[PDB]
Amino acid sequence: MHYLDNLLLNTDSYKASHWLQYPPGTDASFFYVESRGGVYDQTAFFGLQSILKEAINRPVTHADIDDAKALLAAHGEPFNEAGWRDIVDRLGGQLPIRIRAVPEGCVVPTHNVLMTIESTDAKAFWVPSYLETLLLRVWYPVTVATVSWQVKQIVRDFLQRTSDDPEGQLPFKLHDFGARGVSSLGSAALGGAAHLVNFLGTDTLSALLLARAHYHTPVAGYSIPAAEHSTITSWGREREVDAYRNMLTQFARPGAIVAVVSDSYDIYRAIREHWGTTLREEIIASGATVVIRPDSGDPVDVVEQCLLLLDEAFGHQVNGKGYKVLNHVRVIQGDGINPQSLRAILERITAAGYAADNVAFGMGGALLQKVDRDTQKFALKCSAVRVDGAWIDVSKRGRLTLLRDRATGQYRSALLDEVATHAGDSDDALVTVWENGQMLREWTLEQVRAHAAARL
Amino acid sequence: MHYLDNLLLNTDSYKASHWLQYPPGTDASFFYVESRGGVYDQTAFFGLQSILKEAINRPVTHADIDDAKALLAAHGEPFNEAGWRDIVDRLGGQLPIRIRAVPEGCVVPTHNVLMTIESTDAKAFWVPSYLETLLLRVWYPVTVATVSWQVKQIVRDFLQRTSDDPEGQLPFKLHDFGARGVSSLGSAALGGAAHLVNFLGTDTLSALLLARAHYHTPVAGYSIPAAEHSTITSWGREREVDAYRNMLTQFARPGAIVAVVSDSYDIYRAIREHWIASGATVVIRPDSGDPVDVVEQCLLLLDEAFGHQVNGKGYKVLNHVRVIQGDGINPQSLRAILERITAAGYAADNVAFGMGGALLQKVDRDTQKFALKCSAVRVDGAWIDVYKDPITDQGKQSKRGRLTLLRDRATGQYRSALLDEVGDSDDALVTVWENGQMLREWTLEQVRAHADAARL
């Protein structure tokens, strides 16, 4: 990625000449980030720590300026060469900004300050605006973390009603399969880590690498061996049961979990005859759990059909809450899953008397790629500048922060002046996470996961 | 950055388990890529060269294996340590695969082979499937290049009918400003470069860096200084005319082009309520109103204040001023604008378009139904077709066997064909990459030539 290792070019073109647009005598600038609404009423704030670590990873250099000046000139943009040289020569190439943010993992209602960015040097007051492009991409990890968090609340509800161990089951019920469906490796890593705020199951190895490098977590998630259509069908139709038996031979051990896509030829026959008759005793003797995966048919209907046929072959127990738990086998549905279809499946199977323990869900592109900056109407806005020594407002206005009520937990946005006058009942909910080149507050993924305490 | 620098972990977790699942006697695999349909009936192939240069940038090493071995064990996957050590020790850490692709920039109807991947080593025959995750993300640059190419064909049609210089105007008519609305820096670079296949205007500086590093083109695109609305709002309402005045004295010079943003109502007051010498062209961007209506109204008002000349086709061309619409632009609304303004008698010269998230982010793997399928394997010395039964395949695999793409000599038409059958057609794929060596590479100039030659 060394070709992209120049912070001065990690911006929109027109920002190269933007400093010339401020009023004469401008001395400082203040910006905030918020969700202005969208699909969900609240957002799980995540990813700013990774953005800052990766995008601002070294001092700016004179060679950075040389390359940027030449490229921008031929590209058609003026460039503040003298201003950047001053940052290199006088400020050590460190950016004079202060960033404050709500602790990552907190879930905050929309229309609220989530981050603020302020200039810390009078001559280089324009730096916050230069960083708008790379900082506003925080919309992506926030939105993925929010989608994942919203799904977690849905599953938790049905597990509460129908399972004897809701919180033991819950972290494995949404599995991220989206690395092939997202637009970049870097997006897979950050989007996948955003899912891991809420769940433990992932096939996005890049998310483990980002969690290890940026969130102090050596092993942030887990997965299982799983068959693909192409390995099954390479055996030939006549050897479908041998392909399945090989999955057991390689991977079925006591306590192990193994997923097998079972619709290469006919999933009803696969369950009734191959798994449920020919291989049944081998599965029982393995001590393993076999997870059946449909990959065709109506997503809701086929999950219920699978549970019924698996029940007929393997039996069930009834749990403390009166719901059936299949013996030795589970179902995972990755096809056609969104929060609406996921809730529909859970509604269908619990109404048929099956515990939500029996099923798990996969999302791929619907989680990592079918999100955009408008999903939660993300915005980064200038709220105040200092001109001739006086702070001037630029409907949210002035130097702002986020407050949290100590008794109710409710959030609201406020002027910084009111942290003192409202020291009763409310605390400042933002913390300073980055200032003048120094990251000042780091979270572990464990801490982020603890914050994501939020229910609704 | 460096935390993602291990090709062995740039895959889905279950791919670590995958080689154990093939039948005894397997020793080759074959894969093809196609678009199965979707929004558009043809796709511009672009981006594989950047994916290969960045994702496979060095030989695999023993250190890579040690790191992958330890993480995957903790994560829950088996790992083919011996197979990877053999690749490092016997094959120099070079991946034993052959990739063939249509030359980048070529535009191919859907339902056609665009790429094939085949194993080249009998022991390491499982390597192509291991790379499926990172290779399938070629869907993204192909899809962005396709959206941009489809916009180019619409604008081309209207310029041919109403402009005296269609091909001179065309490359500046769609401007990318998606860098803040895309999910990561890497996606901004690769998606932004996909737009540069068709057009010259971009605010995505990351795309310039990728075009230079991966497509050998140091200055691939251009932009102009542009007023930020909120910075103008920082001068105070009583000095808003002062703010726009500053914009021109800083940037407006003879051959220059400068953009000013404005609320549509203030364009009215400026010309009808009353609220040329620099030699520059000023491009006005309205920020309010309906996209089709407001562009027509701006042209009418601007005609009042600046006048126009009639070109050789009979259409009015404004003096000194142009209009760019960057709000609400998608291919359908862009065509509605061109219909309206040309019905009003204005040449397509007068207007340009911007797309942001709508170009770089609001696309997914389903936009062009992008597929990568294993279509054949060799087992016990015989090549066999690989496929799900038609009743469960749901149309996702249209082809079987070892395949290529042909170009008809008489008609220039593309069609897909079995390699064993391959008469008045030439093979349209070239071998771009084999066993660690990039065998055919393109400059962006060549890519653009391919795409610009394609029509409809």
Numbering used by the authors:
A (entry chain A): 1 to 394, 406 to 463, 465 to 468
B (entry chain B): 1 to 275, 284 to 430, 435 to 468
What does the paper say about this structure?
We obtained two apo structures from two types of crystals, namely the tablet-shaped (1.79 Å) and diamond-shaped (2.08 Å) crystals. These structures had almost identical overall conformations (RMSD, 0.3 Å). However, since the structure determined from the diamond-shaped crystal was incomplete in domain A, we focused on describing the more complete apo structure obtained from the tablet-shaped crystal. The NAMPT monomer consists of 19 α-helices and 18 β-strands, which can be divided into two domains, domain A and domain B. Domain A is a typical β/α barrel that has a letter-C-like shape, which is formed by a five-stranded β sheet (β6, β7, β8, β11, and β12) wrapped around by 11 α helices (α7-α17). Domain B is consisted of a central β sandwich that is covered on one face by 5 helices (α1, α2, α3, α4, and α5). There are two molecules in an asymmetric unit of the Xcc NAMPT crystal, which assemble into a compact and stable dimer that covers a surface area of 4140 Å2. The dimeric structure of Xcc NAMPT consists of two protomers arranged head to tail, with domain A on one protomer interacting with domain B on the other protomer. In particular, the open side of the C-shape β/α barrel in domain A packs against a four-helix bundle in domain B to create a complete active site. It should be noted that the active site is not entirely closed but instead exposed to the solvent through two openings: an entrance situated directly above the active site and a separate lateral tunnel.
Nicotinamide phosphoribosyltransferase (NAMPT) plays an important role in the biosynthesis of nicotinamide adenine dinucleotide (NAD+) via the nicotinamide (NAM) salvage pathway. Here, we demonstrated the NAMPT-mediated salvage pathway is functional in the Gram-negative phytopathogenic bacterium Xanthomonas campestris pv. campestris (Xcc) for the synthesis of NAD+, and the enzyme activity of NAMPT in this bacterium is significantly higher than that of human NAMPT in vitro. Our structural analyses of Xcc NAMPT, both in isolation and in complex with either the substrate NAM or the product nicotinamide mononucleotide (NMN), uncovered significant details of substrate recognition. Specifically, we revealed the presence of a NAM binding tunnel that connects the active site, and this tunnel is essential for both catalysis and inhibitor binding.
